Design a protein around this ligand. Structure first.
Ligand SMILES: Nc1nc2c(ncn2[C@@H]2O[C@H](COP(=O)(O)OP(=O)(O)NP(=O)(O)O)[C@@H](O)[C@H]2O)c(=O)[nH]1
Ligand SMILES: Nc1nc2c(ncn2[C@@H]2O[C@H](COP(=O)(O)OP(=O)(O)NP(=O)(O)O)[C@@H](O)[C@H]2O)c(=O)[nH]1
Ligand SMILES: *CCC(=O)Nc1ccc(S(=O)(=O)N2CCCC2)cc1
Ligand SMILES: *CCC(=O)Nc1ccc(S(=O)(=O)N2CCCC2)cc1
Ligand SMILES: [Mg+2]
Ligand SMILES: [Mg+2]
Lengths: 207, 211
């Protein structure tokens, strides 16, 4: 196992794309809103974002090469229903593998909120959630970052090992919203992401 | 071409840097001004920064483990017509220091988003490090998070006169072609270190007063 020139080139392409997007944002919809998905390798961060932006799902596992991001134009309505604000979403997608930890952690600063995933069929991924939350508290660029927790793969009921009460209890302990999602059939994907957007919007509207 | 992934000790070092950075940012003098030094491995980026902040120099080569930064509090005074040097301003400088080796290229490029300006070094004793400058500027155009970023070019190790290979004419011509200030520096004895960095700071500060 070694850092190949291809993989470094793929990452630099993501970074080239990211600077072009920020440069296009300088010459200036309402807001550009950035969040970041993180969690153990294989929990489904890439599939969750693909289902949200495209409504599609691939069953074949293509682990993320360090870092990638997607975009989506949505309308956001503040809370009673506010007038729709055009929002440009940048959806950062991080590799979960430990070898990418330093690289992905460098991108926490560009994130206004975090979509934290675990795998309802993989108990270690759920157990690691507190470590991920510690890492966010230590590395985000604001005390008490906004986080939405997703127990993903809710469509694999027979493979489920994380009991829903334990997840609700964990989330309640940290004061963070919890959704059970499926990237395969779309259940609760948009509800989780819209809740995260609502946290970011509500916070900005507080300053 | 078989670049190693980071070791646990390399990653532990880099994560400490990111932790220090997050704490610095969360505290938010009167201006946090950030720039980033880059260029080939061995040209003296780390040494130039340590001479600037501490007035010291170590002849031993301790190659940078991916990324680091140093800090300095300084007082900046604007420059106006008639040389009307304005009020002293408290500047908190964060000075990003990148590894030159290709193995670290994608990690170090992930920090361009935090730089307001760039200190670009070559080695006066190393022709190839100067020939690589055009590629470095190109990568800066492509990856900086503003158009035409402010750059100051440094030809470093001016104290090794017997070993100099880069002719002054080609460096000056290259800097003229790109519109960038050029200084010949020595991290060993300090010559032009503060001058090059203060010029970069002045470009950044003037840029802000325009916006
Ligand atoms: N049935 C089902 N499979 C899912 C779901 N989400 C992801 N998968 C599958 O689980 C695997 C991992 O998905 P993926 O999105 O690549 O995970 P990741 O979190 O991005 N991994 P990495 O951090 O390594 O890039 C893939 O084979 C994918 O098809 C889900 O909700 N249901
Ligand atoms: N005589 C002299 N030696 C210098 C000067 N600047 C650096 N050196 C020496 O040249 C070597 C490389 O310096 P260093 O600052 O580590 O270079 P670097 O650009 O940070 N390398 P890397 O990208 O691998 O971290 C060291 O042995 C250092 O002492 C200088 O101006 N004069
Ligand atoms: C934990 C981080 C947080 O609460 N907020 C936050 C705010 C802004 C940014 S940003 O760097 O992307 N930014 C906003 C407008 C341009 C730059 C990140 C996180
Ligand atoms: C090449 C970029 C430039 O000229 N100036 C510049 C201005 C501000 C910043 S920033 O680090 O404060 N920032 C905050 C969130 C995104 C950008 C960098 C560079
Ligand atoms: Mg992935
Ligand atoms: Mg160095």
């Amino acid at each position: 196992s070694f850092l190949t020139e291809e993989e470094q080139e793929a990452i630099m392409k993501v970074l080239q794309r990211d600077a072009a997007l920020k440069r296009a944002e300088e010459e200036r919809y309402d807001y550009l809103i950035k969040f970041l998905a993180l969690g153990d390798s294989g929990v489904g961060k890439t599939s969750v974002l693909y289902q949200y932006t495209d409504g599609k799902f691939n069953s074949k596992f293509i682990t993320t090469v360090g870092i990638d991001f997607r975009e989506k134009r949505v309308v956001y309505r503040a809370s009673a229903t506010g007038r729709g604000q055009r929002i440009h979403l940048q959806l950062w997608d991080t590799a979960g593998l430990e070898r990418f930890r330093s690289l992905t952690t460098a991108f926490f600063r560009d994130a206004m909120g975090f979509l934290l995933l675990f795998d309802l069929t993989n108990e270690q991924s759920f157990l690691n959630v507190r470590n991920w939350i510690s890492q966010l508290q230590m590395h985000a660029y604001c005390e008490n970052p906004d986080i939405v927790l997703c127990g993903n793969k809710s469509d694999l009921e027979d493979q489920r090992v994380v009991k829903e009460e334990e997840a609700i209890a964990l989330a309640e302990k940290y004061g963070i919203p919890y959704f059970e999602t499926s990237a395969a059939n779309g259940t609760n994907i948009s509800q989780a992401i819209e809740m995260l957007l609502d946290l970011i919007m509500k916070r900005m509207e507080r300053s």
